[PDB]
Design a protein around this ligand. Structure first.
Ligand code: F42
Length: 276
């Protein structure tokens, strides 16, 4: 599938640069602006509308909603509105949620891993029954979550890290091979209709990839330097090397929808220039 590039921007209360940041993303060649769903961050659909008002080309996506924060019928109303009032520019990524303190602050039941995944399942089923027009993305690497992506999603987002719900660890390329294969087996005949996304956490410009990876073992001691050089959540080297890496990873994993974090917006833009 043709590449599409996203930048995960954090609309921040008290910071007056939202419109300028969204314009920079579009001017830098990104195809998607992605926004998160967290307490203490601006409300995602309202921020996406504010982005739509100052951009013309980019798609706007939630990346990803905390399913515990949304009533499915009311979310369906939001999605239809966002779709119609932007001219079809909105996509909705969904997840189970994972920050327990935020559930507690909002007065919501943390429950169990099972109830949190079931809430995502129930929401996805409802959104499809209500025939929402926004493309749907599902994010997360748990078995049940990838099964839901395979059943319901237009895009599956493969995480690239794990944590203990209630600390972050990057997964290896080999673990990622297995998660993509699991998804594909669950998707069956629908595999070819689901776009594959991943989020790159760090985009590290360097003229010495090997020395950089060796140094980075300090922050990820559970990995070798060779594993660090193959980690799907990291891009290391020159822009030409990073472009070649993304071509190789599209072949290996099927990743054609690549997002980066806001801090690396400018660092990654040269790669967009080379892949287009
Ligand atoms: C928690 C995570 O599961 P997951 O299925 O990968 O992801 C579930 C949710 O986090 C996920 O669906 C989404 O909500 C997360 N999500 C966001 N969630 C949000 O709430 N807000 C966001 O802005 C957000 C952004 C986002 C972007 C990309 C992406 O891929 C996911 C994103 C995980 O790391 N799972 C581990 C295991 C987790 C676990 O339970 N560990 C044990 C270990 C220790 C023990 O034994 O007790 C535990 O702590 O209980 C695994 O599958 O190996």
């Amino acid at each position: 599938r043709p590449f599409r590039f996203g930048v995960n921007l954090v609309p921040t209360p008290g910071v007056s640069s939202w419109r300028e940041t969204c314009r920079t993303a579009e001017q830098s060649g990104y195809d998607v602006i992605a926004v998160p769903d967290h307490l203490g961050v601006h409300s995602p659909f309202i921020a996406m509308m504010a982005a739509a008002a100052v951009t013309e080309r980019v798609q706007l996506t939630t990346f990803v909603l905390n399913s515990a924060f949304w009533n499915p019928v009311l979310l369906a109303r939001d999605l239809l509105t966002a779709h119609e009032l932007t001219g079809g520019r909105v996509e909705a990524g969904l997840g189970t949620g994972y920050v327990r303190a935020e559930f507690e602050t909002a007065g919501l039941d943390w429950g169990t891993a099972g109830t949190r995944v079931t809430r995502l399942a129930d929401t996805l089923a409802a959104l499809r029954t209500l025939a929402v027009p926004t493309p749907l993305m599902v994010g997360g690497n748990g078995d049940r979550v990838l099964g839901l992506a395979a059943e319901h999603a237009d895009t599956v987002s493969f995480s690239g890290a794990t944590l203990t719900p209630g600390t972050l660890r990057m997964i290896t390329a080999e673990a990622m091979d297995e998660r993509v294969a699991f998804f594909a087996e669950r998707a069956g005949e629908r595999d070819s209709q689901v776009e594959r996304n991943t989020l790159v956490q760090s985009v590290i410009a360097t003229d010495d990839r090997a020395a950089t990876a060796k140094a980075m073992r300090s922050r990820m001691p559970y990995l070798t330097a060779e594993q660090i050089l193959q980690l799907p959540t990291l891009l290391i080297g020159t822009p030409a090397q990073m472009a070649e890496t993304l071509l190789e990873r599209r072949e290996r994993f099927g990743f054609s929808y690549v997002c980066v974090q806001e801090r690396y917006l400018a660092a990654f833009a040269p790669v967009i220039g080379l892949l287009g």
